[PDB]
Ligand binder design. Structure first.
Ligand code: HEM
Ligand code: HEM
Lengths: 146, 134
């Protein structure tokens, strides 16, 4: 996907206003609560038996931070997401067997959480650019499956 | 169960036509292909047409929350319109549902808990399934 200079600058500025710890925990927690089959991949994280248990799980939060850190790498390489995410794509396909549809779901939960976090600042225009970002990341991660 | 999705819908302002209008605006901007279903609409930002349509969508969903026991019956005419007459590709319902969640979360994050998020996602998917059926 191609972001213009202005689209890139806008997603950069907005990400900087974000509490990454909160957004990471919120995103991965909501993935597990809203799409409960994704819990199968995270058995080792412990108690996921209720929404409150999921959102209060420290391993979910710490993992969410690692996922956000990967999005950060992506934002610095929007012209080469496939190369950037090649090892992670291999991990999710060949080791973890995550169906690539779930990459799209996580991206869209991130968009819902950015909206939740940022309110009016997350404008319809801001969202358009962020949809390009999360689509690009999902596509890059799905590449080893191809 | 049917009271709680109903409760959640009101608490995040699902009744509000303005939020329906914002969800449409978000959809049109993020997913430009969806505009091809509305060639008769002025797309100018403060569009009277988008405002009125936002109210239609909000009102229809708000009515539907009172009829969770029988959505196919409640949405019969709307299903005919979307599935038989307009032939809306099912991907588009997922785009609008997502933009509605984005909108509701935007304005009322305190009420848009993970549990409410899950319930409303299921509700909007259920409505989508009915509207995509013949
Ligand atoms: C945009 C989408 C995603 C990104 C950027 C992403 C990123 C990451 C990263 C950075 C790691 C850490 C690897 C390491 O620390 O060496 C990881 C691990 C992992 N990911 Fe993802 N991920 C995504 C989507 C998903 C989805 C949708 C699932 C499952 C539904 C998933 C399941 C896992 C699992 C099970 C691990 C290993 C966790 C552990 O045992 O510590 N990922 N991912
Ligand atoms: C849960 C999802 C949706 C609901 C509740 C909904 C609701 C409605 C309502 C209440 C109307 C007016 C019906 C009437 O006047 O008799 C309508 C019309 C229409 N809908 Fe939807 N809709 C949904 C999804 C979609 C999607 C995803 C699309 C296309 C991207 C779409 C395209 C249209 C079009 C083109 C019309 C005709 C409006 C006009 O000509 O002004 N709808 N919808």
């Amino acid at each position: 996907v191609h972001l213009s200079g202005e689209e890139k600058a806008a997603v950069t500025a907005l990400w900087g206003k974000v509490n990454v710890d909160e957004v990471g925990g919120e995103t991965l927690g909501r993935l597990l609560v809203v799409y409960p089959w994704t819990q199968r991949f995270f058995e080792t994280f412990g108690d996921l038996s209720s929404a409150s248990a999921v959102m209060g799980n420290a391993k979910v939060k710490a993992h969410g931070k690692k996922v956000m850190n990967a999005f950060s790498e992506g934002l610095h390489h929007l012209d080469n997401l496939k190369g950037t995410f090649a090892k992670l794509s291999e991990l999710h396909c060949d080791k973890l067997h995550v169906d690539p549809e779930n990459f799209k779901l996580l991206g869209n939960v991130l968009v819902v959480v950015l909206s939740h976090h940022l309110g009016g600042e997350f404008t319809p225009q801001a969202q358009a650019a962020w949809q390009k970002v999360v689509s690009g990341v999902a596509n890059a991660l799905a590449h080893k499956y191809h | 169960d049917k009271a709680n999705v109903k409760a959640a819908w009101g608490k995040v302002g699902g009744h509000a036509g303005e939020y329906g209008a914002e969800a449409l605006d978000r959809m049109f901007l993020s997913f430009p292909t969806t505009k091809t279903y509305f060639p008769h609409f002025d797309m100018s930002h403060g569009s009277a047409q988008v405002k009125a349509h936002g109210k239609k969508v909000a009102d229809a969903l708000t009515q539907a929350v009172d009829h969770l026991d029988d959505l196919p019956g409640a949405l019969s005419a709307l299903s005919d319109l979307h599935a038989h007459k307009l032939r809306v590709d099912p991907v588009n319902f997922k785009l609008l549902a997502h933009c509605l969640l984005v909108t509701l979360a935007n304005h009322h994050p305190n009420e848009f808990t993970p549990a409410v998020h899950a319930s409303l996602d299921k509700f909007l998917a259920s409505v989508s399934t009915v509207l995509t059926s013949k």
